[PDB]
Amino acid sequence: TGGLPRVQELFEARVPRGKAPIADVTGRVRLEDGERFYKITIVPDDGGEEVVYDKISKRQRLRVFKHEDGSERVLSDGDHVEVGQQLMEGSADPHEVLRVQGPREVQIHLVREVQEVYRAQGVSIHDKHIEVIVRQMLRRVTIIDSGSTEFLPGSLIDRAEFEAENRRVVAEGGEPAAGRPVLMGITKASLATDS
């Protein structure tokens, strides 16, 4: 997509249409071409299990990336890629780059992708205006296990309250609760305020 639908799908943090898979583990790519489905097992460079993306239809071209050769290289069996790299052409999924590459790469991705749409048609907005809105999209934590912290495992709570409770409980009884960062839209974040 492009234009206003692209801006909407970027700000509401939903799964894109033309989703492009990203590399899970840094390694050596083993591109086993199929009939109508590219199959690549990307051999790990440490010894881990083969992460395989399957059922990848032939609806789009491959990714033109740059390697040690210093030239625009198409994805062929023999190349080598690092963590967090699109394999085929399209747009990646923010919820996956989040976990793969930490919280900073998500904000980089979002600001860059929002600015490309506005810069294509020649509109100048400072980056400090999109950072204010991206800052509010990453403010909550999802509990995995609560232990004895008075939390329901699976809810969405603020980072400040989460760390305050985790510091209070360990200082007296002793139990750290679990939580991983999450990304929300602008409609689910507004309906979950404290008023």
What would the two tokens of residue 93 be? 């999924």
What would the two tokens of residue 87 be? 């394999």
Q: Which amino acid is at 95?
A: H
Cβ contacts of 12 within 8 Å, gap of 6 or more: 185, 186, 187
Radius of gyration of the chain (CA): 20
Dist. CA 168–CA 175, nearest whole Å? 9
Phi and psi torsions of 44, nearest 5° = -65, 150
Nearest to 133 by CA among 91, 183, 61, 74: 183
What's this structure's resolution in Å?
A: 3.0
Kindly provide the b/e burial profile for residues 107-123, where b requires at least 16 CB atoms within 10 angstroms of the residue's own CB: bebbbebbeebeeeeee
